[PDB]
Ligand binder design. Sequence first.
Ligand code: HEC
Length: 107
Amino acid sequence: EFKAGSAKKGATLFKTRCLQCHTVEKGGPHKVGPNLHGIFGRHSGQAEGYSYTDANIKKNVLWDENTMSEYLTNPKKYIPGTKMAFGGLKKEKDRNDLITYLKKASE
Ligand code: HEC
């Protein structure tokens, strides 16, 4: 599903649609949502010091581009009971862009 996109456009999507709840940089603080540094390649629910729902932890998904993509289409469907209040990125090109950005910034 996932196809490489534009990191630049991904940056704008993140600013607009995610930054209110999430920081990305190494050492960034938690907010409404967890800091996302190092999210890719990790199991869900493992950002240190963050208070996750049991739903998020029990999902037991390894985050990669493709699982991220399916998650961001409809977070509540992918992880029933998650407290992440976000409807979804419905456009495939938006998911691709955001993920391209996030893969790089969260490294
Ligand atoms: C606040 C209203 C949020 C917005 C906007 C976005 N997210 Fe979020 N996210 C939020 C919370 C409170 C949580 C924790 C959910 C829980 O049930 O505990 C999350 C979780 C994520 C995760 C999973 C993290 C994990 O460690 O497994 C990811 C990957 C994530 N959020 C990404 C994400 C992106 C890319 C967003 C922009 C589209 C976004 N979130 C919006 C709160 C909020």
